[PDB]
């Protein structure tokens, strides 16, 4: 496998302090109102913490 | 240490870790306050609860048990709700007099639907055995099968 | 004599058959030794 190299790199798309907070990650969001029978269309995978 | 070990042992399933800490109420008085913090096992998300199977159970009890165990928050739900549902179902069936009607297991965790699949049982095979006990002073009875 | 009882207690603690029977679906219970360190060089992942 190609070897990973750990060299720090300089800022891009943001100032050095922060990271990309508003990046979209595919993970379902749960509504507080109970849904009796409705598939989430995306399994939450590993359920336990 | 003894309290922590005893609390961990006696409530192993629900609680993942119990921490005991001491904080001085006053520095000179040497009197202290003891704080117990409990962290139980949790699920990343549980939204609704359902019971499948249990043909003998009327719909009224099905609605009642569902209303009894409604989670307050849909995030970081502890693992006590499934045990509570199982306990309620087992208690109802045992009160009815059937001991072998038990909750099979739980499914629907992928979709965040805690569903308890109750599996019932029926009498299948009946057999008979004939035995005869002997008499002796060995204090351990022996049997002859006929 | 105490060593055998200590081993029995260790077996109770670390290989509780109740937990590992239902571990994958609603728990997390894995066999590991004692914790040896708290921090590591960031390039240890290359070992994998």
Nearest to B79 by CA among B69, B89, B88: B69
**Among C26, C28, C42, whose Cβ lies nearest the Cβ of A6?**
C42
Contact B12 C16 (CB under 8 A): yes
Chain C contact for A6 (CB, 8 A cutoff)? yes
Contact C26 B41 (CB under 8 A): yes
∠ CA C33-C38-C42, rounded to 5°: 110
Reduce the DSSP state of residue B5 to 3 states and report it.
helix
Experimental structure resolution, Å:
2.8
Contact B82 C26 (CB under 8 A): yes
Nearest to B43 by CA among B16, B12, B11, B8: B16
β-pairing verdict for B102-107 and B42-45: unpaired
Reduce the DSSP state of residue B51 to 3 states and report it.
strand
Reduce the DSSP state of residue C8 to 3 states and report it.
helix
Alpha-carbon span B106 to B114, nearest angstrom: 7
H or E element, residue B42: strand B42-45
Unique residue bearing structure tokens 């290989």 = C15
Looking at the DSSP assignment, which residues form a beta bridge with residue B145? B131
Name the experiment that determined this structure. cryo-EM
Alpha-carbon span A40 to A47, nearest angstrom: 14
Q: Could you tell me the end-to-end alpha-carbon distance of chain B, in angstroms, rounded to an integer?
A: 59
Alpha-carbon span C14 to B121, nearest angstrom: 35
Alpha-carbon span A10 to B59, nearest angstrom: 64
Chains near C (3 or more Cβ pairs under 8 Å): A, B
């Amino acid at each position: 496998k190609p070897l990973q190299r750990y060299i720090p790199q300089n800022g891009g798309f943001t100032w050095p302090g922060d990271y990309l907070r508003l990046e979209i990650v595919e993970m379902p969001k749960l509504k507080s109102i109970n849904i009796k029978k409705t598939s989430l269309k995306q399994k939450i995978n590993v359920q336990p913490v | 240490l003894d309290d922590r070990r005893k609390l961990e042992i006696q409530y192993e399933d629900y609680i993942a870790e119990v921490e005991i800490r001491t904080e001085y109420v006053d520095g000179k008085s040497n009197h202290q306050r003891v704080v117990y913090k409990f962290t139980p096992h949790q699920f990343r998300g549980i939204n609704a609860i359902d019971i499948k199977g249990a043909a003998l159970m009327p719909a009224s009890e099905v609605e009642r048990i569902c209303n009894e165990c409604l989670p307050k928050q849909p995030y970081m739900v502890d693992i006590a709700v499934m045990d509570k549902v199982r306990n309620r179902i087992e208690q109802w069936y045992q009160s009815r007099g059937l001991p072998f009607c038990y909750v099979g297991f739980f499914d629907g965790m992928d979709d965040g639907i805690l569903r308890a699949n109750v599996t019932e049982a029926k009498i299948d095979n009946v057999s008979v055995r004939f035995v005869r006990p002997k008499l002796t002073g060995d204090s351990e009875l022996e049997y002859s099968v006929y | 004599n105490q060593i055998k009882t200590k081993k029995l207690v260790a077996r109770r603690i670390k290989k509780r058959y109740k937990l590992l029977k239902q571990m994958p679906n609603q728990l997390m219970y894995s066999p590991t030794g004692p914790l040896l360190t708290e921090v590591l060089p960031s390039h240890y992942i290359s070992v994998f």
